[PDB]
Design a protein around this ligand. Structure first.
Ligand SMILES: CNCCCC[C@H](N)C(=O)O
Length: 315
């Protein structure tokens, strides 16, 4: 079999130490208890504020492929078994969230008991989920508070934002007057969020809510008065320290073109909070920037220890 050890010798290279990764990205001793066919609840990666009924369509190592019941397979997506974005059947009900029903169902025609009987399926057991809303909420962040946030799809924009959901230790950042397509989950240390008035103290422009009247003259105090909303308090923002990944360090990363695959990778370039991934043996055209805390990058040896195939360098 291909060997990391042999590869490092051949390339005179080094791996990114485990210490540079979050424990969740590095942990390999947890068993993946998810099984083909089990059903559960989870957010739609395309619409992060929404919850759907999902079925385990494939299991591979410490990862699983999820399918949106009743919908096209083209919507399928992969997550790690320790994902905080999935929850046990019944979770939405116990936490006050809304659940979009499977294609073909009206929301009232939905009850997990009838559904499971009609599909002769089993709901994934509760003990397999890291997120069940039993842990503490993020400090200082409550649904309804306002803040300023970088649009990660348009990073040159720091917009007026709100906290619209809180699950365990994370919260959902929402861009005022847009749908949820630009929303993202994060924690108090995210380098993409700032307290109200940040843009002003920085001399950077602030982007007001979509179609806000007379945008050129947006005033936070006025908007907060209009909405009766309060600003996330400044003490709540505890941005994380820049990561310590150095160029040329090697690691393992999920392929962004074909998520089923994980390949041998190297750090091509770095920023304070992101690293540019290069897939050994492939064109640099495939190189991509990714946040250092992304769940899809892991230390060398992750695939082997978890039982997931690792694609060696092209050629
Ligand atoms: C939260 N920011 C959203 C920015 C969307 C930008 C896009 N060009 C548009 O105007 O549709």
């Amino acid at each position: 079999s291909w060997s990391w050890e042999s590869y490092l010798e051949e390339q005179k290279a080094i791996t990114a130490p485990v210490s540079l990764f979050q424990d969740s990205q590095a942990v390999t001793h947890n068993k993946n208890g998810f099984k083909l066919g089990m059903k559960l609840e989870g957010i739609d990666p395309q619409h992060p504020s929404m919850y759907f009924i999902l079925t385990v369509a494939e299991v591979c190592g410490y990862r699983l492929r999820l399918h949106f019941d009743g919908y096209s397979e083209c919507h399928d997506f992969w997550v790690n078994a320790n994902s905080p974005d999935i929850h046990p059947a019944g979770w939405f009900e116990k936490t006050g969230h809304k659940l979009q029903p499977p294609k073909g169902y009206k929301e009232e025609e939905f009850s997990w008991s009838q559904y499971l009987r009609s599909t002769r399926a089993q709901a994934a057991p509760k003990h397999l989920f890291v997120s069940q809303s039993h842990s503490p909420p993020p400090l200082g962040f409550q649904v309804g508070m306002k803040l300023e946030a970088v649009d990660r799809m348009n990073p040159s924009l720091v917009c007026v934002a709100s906290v619209t959901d809180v699950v365990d230790s994370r919260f959902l950042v929402h861009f005022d007057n847009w749908d949820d397509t630009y929303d993202y989950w994060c924690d108090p240390s995210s380098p993409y969020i700032h307290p109200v008035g940040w843009c002003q103290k920085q001399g950077k422009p602030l982007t007001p809510p979509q179609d806000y009247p007379d945008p050129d003259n947006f005033c936070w105090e006025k908007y907060l008065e209009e909405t009766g909303a309060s600003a996330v308090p400044t003490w709540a923002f505890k941005v994380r320290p820049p990561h310590s990944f150095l160029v040329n360090m090697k690691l393992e990363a999920v392929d962004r073109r074909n998520p089923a695959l994980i390949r041998v990778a190297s750090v091509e370039d770095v920023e304070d909070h992101r690293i540019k991934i290069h897939f050994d043996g492939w064109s640099h055209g495939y190189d991509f920037w990714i946040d250092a805390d992304h769940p899809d990058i892991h230390p060398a040896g992750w695939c082997s220890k978890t039982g997931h195939p690792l694609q060696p360098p092209l050629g």
